[PDB]
Amino acid sequence: DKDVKYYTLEEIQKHKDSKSTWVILHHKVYDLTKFLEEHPGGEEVLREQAGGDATENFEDVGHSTDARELSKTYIIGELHPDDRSKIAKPSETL
Numbered sequence: 881d882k883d884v885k886y887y888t889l890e891e892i893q894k895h896k897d898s899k900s901t902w903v904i905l906h907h908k909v910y911d912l913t914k915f916l917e918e919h920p921g922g923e924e925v926l927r928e929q930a931g932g933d934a935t936e937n938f939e940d941v942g943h944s945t946d947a948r949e950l951s952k953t954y955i956i957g958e959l960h961p962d963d964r965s966k967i968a969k970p971s972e973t974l
C-alpha cells in the first residue's frame with residue numbers, strides 16, 4: 881500500500897549524484913531520479929537541490945494541488961527520528 885524507510889540525513893545526502901536524485905521535503909524523503917526530465921519546471925533546479933532541502937524552494941513557489949498527490953508517488957522514505965529531534969535549524973528560511 882505504502883511504507884516509508886526512515887533514512888538519515890547522511891544516507892539521503894549520499895543519494896544526490898548520478899542515479900539517486902533524492903531530496904528532503906517538509907520532513908520526509910522523495911526520489912526525483914526518473915522525475916528529473918518529466919518535472920514540468922526543469923531538471924537543473926532539482927539537481928541543484930538534490931540531497932538538500934528543496935521544500936524551502938518549492939513552498940515559495942506553491943506547487944499545484946495535483947503535485948500534492950503525485951508527491952506521494954515520488955515519496956521514498958521519512959526523515960529519520962534521530963536527526964528529527966535536532967533539525968539543527970537552518971535558522972530561517974523560506
Ligand code: HEM
Pocket residue numbers: 903910912919920921922925926929934935937938941943944946947948949950951952954
Ligand atoms: C525538489 C523540489 C522541487 C523544486 C525545487 C521544484 C521547483 C519547480 C519549479 C521552479 C517549477 C516551475 C515553476 C514556474 O515555471 O513558474 C516547478 C513546476 C512544477 N513542479 Fe516542481 N519542484 C520540486 C519538486 C516537485 C515534485 C516532487 C513534483 C511532483 C509532485 C513537482 C511537480 C511540479 C509541477 C506539476 C509543476 C508545474 C507547475 C505549473 O506550471 O502549473 N515538483 N517546480
